[PDB]
Curated annotation (Swiss-Prot), chain C:
It comes from Saccharomyces cerevisiae (strain ATCC 204508 / S288c). This is Proteasome subunit beta type-2. GO terms for cellular component: cytosol; nucleus; proteasome complex; proteasome core complex, beta-subunit complex; proteasome storage granule. Gene3D superfamilies: Glutamine Phosphoribosylpyrophosphate, subunit 1, domain 1. Keywords: Cytoplasm, Hydrolase, Nucleus, Protease, Proteasome, Threonine protease, Zymogen. It holds the Pfam family Proteasome. It is found in: Cytoplasm; Nucleus. The gene is PUP1. The side chain of Thr-1 acts as a nucleophile, and the N-terminal amino group acts as a proton acceptor.
Curated annotation (Swiss-Prot), chain E:
It comes from Saccharomyces cerevisiae (strain ATCC 204508 / S288c). It is found in: Cytoplasm; Nucleus. Its main location: cytoplasm. GO terms for biological process: proteasomal ubiquitin-independent protein catabolic process; proteasome-mediated ubiquitin-dependent protein catabolic process. The 26S proteasome consists of a 20S proteasome core and two 19S regulatory subunits. The 20S proteasome core is composed of 28 subunits that are arranged in four stacked rings, resulting in a barrel-shaped structure. The two end rings are each formed by seven alpha subunits, and the two central rings are each formed by seven beta subunits. The catalytic chamber with the active sites is on the inside of the barrel. The proteasome degrades poly-ubiquitinated proteins in the cytoplasm and in the nucleus. It is essential for the regulated turnover of proteins and for the removal of misfolded proteins. The proteasome is a multicatalytic proteinase complex that is characterized by its ability to cleave peptides with Arg, Phe, Tyr, Leu, and Glu adjacent to the leaving group at neutral or slightly basic pH. It has an ATP-dependent proteolytic activity. GO terms for cellular component: nucleus; proteasome complex; proteasome core complex, alpha-subunit complex; proteasome storage granule. GO terms for molecular function: mRNA binding. Belongs to the peptidase T1A family. The keyword Cytoplasm applies.
Curated annotation (Swiss-Prot), chain F:
The proteasome degrades poly-ubiquitinated proteins in the cytoplasm and in the nucleus. It is essential for the regulated turnover of proteins and for the removal of misfolded proteins. The proteasome is a multicatalytic proteinase complex that is characterized by its ability to cleave peptides with Arg, Phe, Tyr, Leu, and Glu adjacent to the leaving group at neutral or slightly basic pH. It has an ATP-dependent proteolytic activity. GO terms for biological process: proteasomal ubiquitin-independent protein catabolic process; proteasome-mediated ubiquitin-dependent protein catabolic process. Disulfide bonds: none annotated. This is Proteasome subunit alpha type-2. It comes from Saccharomyces cerevisiae (strain ATCC 204508 / S288c) (Baker's yeast). The gene is PRE8. Signal peptide: none annotated. Transmembrane segments: none annotated.
UniProtKB/Swiss-Prot annotation, chain I:
The gene is PRE9. SMART domains: Proteasome_A_N. GO terms for cellular component: cytosol; nucleus; proteasome complex; proteasome core complex, alpha-subunit complex; proteasome storage granule. It is found in: Cytoplasm; Nucleus. There is a cross-link at residues 90, 189, 221 (Glycyl lysine isopeptide (Lys-Gly) (interchain with G-Cter in ubiquitin)). The keyword Nucleus applies. It comes from Saccharomyces cerevisiae (strain ATCC 204508 / S288c) (Baker's yeast). This is Proteasome subunit alpha type-3.
Amino acid sequence: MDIILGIRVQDSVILASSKAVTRGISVLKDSDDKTRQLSPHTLMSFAGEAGDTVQFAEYIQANIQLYSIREDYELSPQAVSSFVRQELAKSIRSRRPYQVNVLIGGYDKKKNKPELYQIDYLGTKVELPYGAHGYSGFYTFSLLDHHYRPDMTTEEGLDLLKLCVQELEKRMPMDFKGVIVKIVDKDGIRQVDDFQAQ
Amino acid sequence: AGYDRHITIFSPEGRLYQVEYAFKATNQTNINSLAVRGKDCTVVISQKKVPDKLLDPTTVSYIFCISRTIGMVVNGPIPDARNAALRAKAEAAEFRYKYGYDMPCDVLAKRMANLSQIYTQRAYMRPLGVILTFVSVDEELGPSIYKTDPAGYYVGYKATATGPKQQEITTNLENHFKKSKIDHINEESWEKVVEFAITHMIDALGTEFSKNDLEVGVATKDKFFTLSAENIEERLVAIAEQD
Amino acid sequence: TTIVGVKFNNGVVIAADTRSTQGPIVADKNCAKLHRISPKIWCAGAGTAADTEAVTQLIGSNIELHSLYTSREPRVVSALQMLKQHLFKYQGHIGAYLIVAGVDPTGSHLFSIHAHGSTDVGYYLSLGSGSLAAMAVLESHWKQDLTKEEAIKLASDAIQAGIWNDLGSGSNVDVCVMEIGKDAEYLRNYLTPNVREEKQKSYKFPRGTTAVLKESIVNICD
Amino acid sequence: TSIMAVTFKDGVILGADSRTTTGAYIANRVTDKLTRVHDKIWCCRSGSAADTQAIADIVQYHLELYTSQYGTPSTETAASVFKELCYENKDNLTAGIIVAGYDDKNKGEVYTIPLGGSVHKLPYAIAGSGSTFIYGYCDKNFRENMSKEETVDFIKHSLSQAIKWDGSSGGVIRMVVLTAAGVERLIFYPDEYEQL
Amino acid sequence: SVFSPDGRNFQVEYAVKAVENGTTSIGIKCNDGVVFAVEKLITSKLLVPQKNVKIQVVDRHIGCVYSGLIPDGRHLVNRGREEAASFKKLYKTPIPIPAFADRLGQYVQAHTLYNSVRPFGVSTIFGGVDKNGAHLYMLEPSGSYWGYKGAATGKGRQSAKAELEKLVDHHPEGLSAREAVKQAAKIIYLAHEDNKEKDFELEISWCSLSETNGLHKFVKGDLLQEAIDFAQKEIN
Amino acid sequence: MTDRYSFSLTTFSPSGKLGQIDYALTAVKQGVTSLGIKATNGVVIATEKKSSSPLAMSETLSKVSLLTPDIGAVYSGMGPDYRVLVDKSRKVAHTSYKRIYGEYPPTKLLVSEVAKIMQEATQSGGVRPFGVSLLIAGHDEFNGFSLYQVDPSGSYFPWKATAIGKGSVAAKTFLEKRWNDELELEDAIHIALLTLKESVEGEFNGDTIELAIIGDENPDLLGYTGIPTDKGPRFRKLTSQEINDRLEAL
Amino acid sequence: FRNNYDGDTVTFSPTGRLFQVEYALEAIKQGSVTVGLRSNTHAVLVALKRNADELSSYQKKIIKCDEHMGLSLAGLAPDARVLSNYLRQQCNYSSLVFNRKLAVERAGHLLCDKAQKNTQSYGGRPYGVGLLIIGYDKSGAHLLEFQPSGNVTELYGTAIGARSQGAKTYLERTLDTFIKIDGNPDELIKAGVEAISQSLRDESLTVDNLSIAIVGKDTPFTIYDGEAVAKYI
Amino acid sequence: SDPSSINGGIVVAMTGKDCVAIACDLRLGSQSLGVSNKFEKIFHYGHVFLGITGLATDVTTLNEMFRYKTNLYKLKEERAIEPETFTQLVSSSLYERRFGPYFVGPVVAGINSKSGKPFIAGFDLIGCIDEAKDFIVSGTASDQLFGMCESLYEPNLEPEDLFETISQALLNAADRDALSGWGAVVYIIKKDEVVKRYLKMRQD
Amino acid sequence: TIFSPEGRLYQVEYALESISHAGTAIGIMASDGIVLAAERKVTSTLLEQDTSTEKLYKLNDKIAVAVAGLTADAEILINTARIHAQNYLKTYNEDIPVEILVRRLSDIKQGYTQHGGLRPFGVSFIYAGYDDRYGYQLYTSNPSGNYTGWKAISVGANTSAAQTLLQMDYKDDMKVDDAIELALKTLSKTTDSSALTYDRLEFATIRKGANDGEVYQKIFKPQEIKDILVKTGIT
Ligand SMILES: [Mg+2]
Ligand SMILES: [Mg+2]
Ligand SMILES: [Mg+2]
Ligand SMILES: [Mg+2]
Ligand SMILES: [Mg+2]
Ligand SMILES: [Mg+2]
Ligand SMILES: [Mg+2]
């Protein structure tokens, strides 16, 4: 399935997302960015049902951007994640629920701390040092249970991530075509363009 | 002609002229009615005037059978009268269906007064130009008279009278209850309570009545019914043998 | 659950056991299954517990308003008519089974209501998983013209049949007596035949037994 | 349930047993299955108890209203209100109703409204699970213009046979006699009708 | 929805003026039925004879005639038809005439309760045969209606009522359907006295237990010619 | 069928008055006096039964009403407006409070709901304000005894004592002279009876005066026994005889 | 009397009059003339079309409702469109549901009832158009006249619009002649064009002034304009 | 599958002498996969405590809903909501969603700030009230909890002792359920103060 | 809702006209708190001071309002404002920023100004709040639905006089205790009554909360006002 991992180090939150889009027996694309920037310091990654996935993300993006312009101010990671949870929680009892799981990574400027939020399509939210959706969690949680330290650098976090992707490339039955990696810290959001053979 | 004369909004005096004008409509028919309580019955008398000789006399009536137990006499124009009758019937039938017992007289009255109150408060509805007199022998309260007016006001009476010559009859009755000291006619058979009512109508209005001049409703335990000319004819003969 | 209702010469009595269960497990060993609709109209329920309490409170509330509106004591036939019409509307989805009993200005009344909205009248009735045990006691001892004391005995005995023979029922007996003249008397834990025996040992732990990681005082104020 | 209505010389009689069951358990042995929807219009119910009570309650409401406005309704009018309710909601009703009544004009009448919501005017009618056992007996023993005592006999005999064979039927035999005289409630206990 | 200081509704009173303004129409109750007649003003030789019908049927047993704003009358009859269909649907029996009266009654009255509606500009004479005899009614713009031995409305109402009073007097013991039809022709001819500057066409219908089987039928052919001749003879 | 007055009938005038609210207040003034007085251990509300006819039976028309077991009301102004407000007040105590918290609302909250219902008659399309002022007396565990006035605008104010209607300025005067913070309920009833005599034209007996209290719990009025934490209504309408008994020692 | 009484259609005058309706009637008298007449086999509409300018079109007065039915208009044109669209639908519904051609008479009743609701509803105006409806149904040729009051009458012939009184007096005079023109469309049209002539202070009726329609025993409703009318001027 | 089983978790409340205790585990799972080691299931509003077990999305939602309603309550009433009253507000709120219910098992603990009497209660998912005075249990290990409590409990326990009992009940019931555990938090509540302790427990 | 030829809204103007007869209300923002003071409408000895609030209302834990105008109208708006604050807290898990709440309430008012043919609310508000973005804040809104931000402001009667007096004595470095003094002086000077006594005042603060780091709304009790009326030297 779709790979969506995230890890919170001391000064940033790293998100990594599989690049494959697969329908039936064909890999249609291998450079897919499973991410939308919500605000300058908040990133969302998503996985689940084919259409709902992007549709939900862009919907959240429209709303958060609307807030920023109306208030000339950027919502905290914590506030954005509650807004997201409630949307999914309303969705689970509607006629056709959004089947989308998300990770929210943000740098809170008021507190000067990175924050990671894991939210499933039911609207279950939890703040975590590291998280994952789908089967990929079955490998990475225990890996990180061993390897992760709270005081790691952004560079150390990328190494830990390099370990997680290696494991999944070794053990997962599906070819997810690598990941796109994104860092969220005090200077905003940036893409590590070299990961496939770095 | 300001707006305070045309719809039910307050005037600077705190009055509601449309309500006041609706009271005037009640006498428009020039009919007098009176109602008395017996020991185990309630009787309503109303004048019956048939000016046109083209009219079928049987269809001219201001007394209505609301339910098995409840009768209503109306003072006011027939169309508004029939509007209230129909509604009362529907309310009576509905009460029984929803609550499993017959709607009491006083409760139907309170409800019809509440409807009237609404027309008193909402702009797009006019009040009805009628006064409603409800009678029965309530299973819990005994014989009952309850009367509602265009103001949404209602109350229970020992006896009551309504129409242009309301006052003549009221004082006549007030004088009777002054003497007797009790709050009803001490009499068993309804036939004699009907006779009493006719008598005190005659003395108050200073008029004799033939069988076609009157309309009578009787409410006893578990039935309200009206009298035909012949039951009235029989009642007029009875009063004639002494008075 | 075992609930019964028995008419007597001057009124009506209802009784129930005090056991609620989640499947095989006993949640409350002494709950009250006797409910008030109005002061003199009381109610016992089986089926979906929440449904029977809710339908009792809904109709109880509306009956209060009717009583105020009409200036009259609430009548049992009104409680019945409203319950049955409500239950019917929901075609059985509100799983309330009720024995409703009371005294009103027209006398004393005993009725049963089934979740689909059917009603019946009778002199003695039972509902609940314990109904057959109690019905067999009722069918054995009910006579016409019972005194108050005979009625309480009979109803109480019926609930015991349920307590001893139905795994769904247990613990204690509650009774409510409704006589035509008087105020209704609710008799909570009328019988208590199922007292727990004293345990063999005291399980109170020596202080310190439990290992603690961290600790802090919690603020209630502001 | 065993239920029937029979027209005779002077009016109509309705009869029923008094058993109600959920499965093989007798919920009620003394049910009154004979239901009044107007002074001299009564019905017998079969099918879902919830459905038939709710229906009966609505019909009685319509005929009380009818009577306030237009006077006494015919038995045909009663039957039509039943049909209307039964036909229009046929998807969520299990209701088998027999309508019987007496007025002075049309005398004694019987209508039957089975599961579909159709109406059938008949000299007599049987219904309920127990009725199936007495089709042959009834067809063989019914005559028009029977006396009161003869009709009580026919219903008593028929319903005893139906009670004998159908486990859903039983208890007492209730009857209601509908004539110009008025309304008469009858009851017959097992010790009488078994001995027939 | 406006009461005057003395308790009147001027709008209704003005509605009556539109009725008084209309063609004259009548209804006569006989011993087993009812007869309806109306004056059709021939405005021009271009109007097709027999082909501008005014008398309308409701269900199968009820006739309706009106004077005033014709459209207003059709609006009422439409409503009467809906109202009778609904009765028959629920109750199987055809609507009794008093029951039908009140249906129209309440409808008309409704149009005097609200500031956003105008009262009807018609009086309607209607009736027919039911379970217990013949009934004739007349209904005013206020919603007032009563039963009638005989009824008239419109321009010639005064002379028509005068003729109706005579019949009630000379015939207490009944009066047949066939006779009442003749008299209807007479009474409409006499009432035409006012509007004598313009020509008129006669229209009669009846509903009789023994003559039409309680169904509403139009008087046509020889029976109409007979009734016309009787009227033309009794006018001279 | 369908309203043509979908606009406010109470609008502002150039000087800032809301005419219909003022005109309704004028209607209150014309009405029969009613009053409330608050003691340490109770509240009393009283008013006069101004009978329409001597042929009418004045017990069939109560001016004092139970709203909840612990809350009662009385009014000055138009009777029918009161009657419907009572129905709605009773209903709203259930729909907005009892059906939610399983208990009856405290006085200030029920008052607040009544005030809301009257406020809306001031703003909605096609209606006139209610022509009444209410006095609402009650008790609740956490607030103690209280008395509130509610006006046709929807305003309410808590009072130690007040009068509304006809002789209200004189009666408010008489109360300011007599009230103190140490009054027992019997004292308050006595003061209430006295105050009402200055207002009352005709007879002054237990048949022409209507008087209710919010005092202690009446377990004999509950209707059932068994549950010891159910103690009975605090609202009690005094009887004709109970009144006459306090007029002899008046 | 005419004072506070013409504000809406929901107000009677003290004379019993509805002025809004009377004002709607005046928009007819203002409109251009049109004539209808029939025999036993055919029915004809003749209409004088009216331009705004010598650079403009002469606007249409005749609308087809079904194969066996159509109408000419006089008054507010947009109101004629609304009424003919409804009449088109009623004709349609009759075909589809009952496989039946709508009786011309029933078309009359339907129009009457529709106009009526607008003479009794607040915040709506009466229709401001007159109509002449012709058709051949199961009882032959018919002509109807419709007035926005709701009054509809069946006639042998008629005319509505400005100066129509001439043609109406003409047809009244010619009654016994034109009623008999059976099985001769061209002669019935001739009598129609000749009838519309008595209503001209205008002029010489041109190839663009004139609009003719016909329906009958073996002819569906058809419209003639321009060159196709030339042979009648 | 069964919504009350997806995430795991337990809550138990007990009364003592002039005190109440309420405890929960810390696990949040997704079937066999444990996701969160810090998921608390007890909340408070003024002096009223509420633990909730079941589907975590409904645990969160109902906390937010009860914060909302108690906040409004306090503003209108000018006092904090009491345990008895709050219990009723939970009930009717759950019952409001009768045919689309929250998949939760709520538990209410607290002391009445007027009368001073300890109060606990429990509910099924549609708001039926379990009114018991000794203990209340909820969650994927409720059978284990009922067992533990019915054995360990005696009335009128001193706060310091009641602590041991409720902790032992929770710990041992937790360890017989695959879906509960992973940490535990215990609240000891007296009219005047509230102490909160994180327990040391098996992390498997 | 219609415009006059001057481009003014009749009903709004007349609503503002009504408000200028209502008891004056004053708000003053200092560096470490806010003050709300207001004058009650000429009451009586028998009015229950203890259980009365006619001008001061809690909106949430961090925001309050002073009312000038129709109380019943204000209660309607206050209740919807309270709800709006709770929706926000439910949606974001953050207390609503003061401006957001003010803008919403203002928008409701504006709506009555622009459609529906209902009369406007005869209310003007002074909002006093704190949030982690703008610190202490003071806003005002009126029946037009316009709102503006202030350091010190008054609404109701004599705002003209009160504004001039506040303008003169206000300084940016004021402590709250100084602002308490200013507000009561200003009401004293602008009153239409013999003296400004405790029974004729409502008073509240939003301070930095004794000793903490949090924020405390203190709605003054009658006896407390009487004391703070002595300290400032008006007895
Ligand atoms: Mg009105
Ligand atoms: Mg109006
Ligand atoms: Mg057992
Ligand atoms: Mg059997
Ligand atoms: Mg006439
Ligand atoms: Mg479990
Ligand atoms: Mg475990």
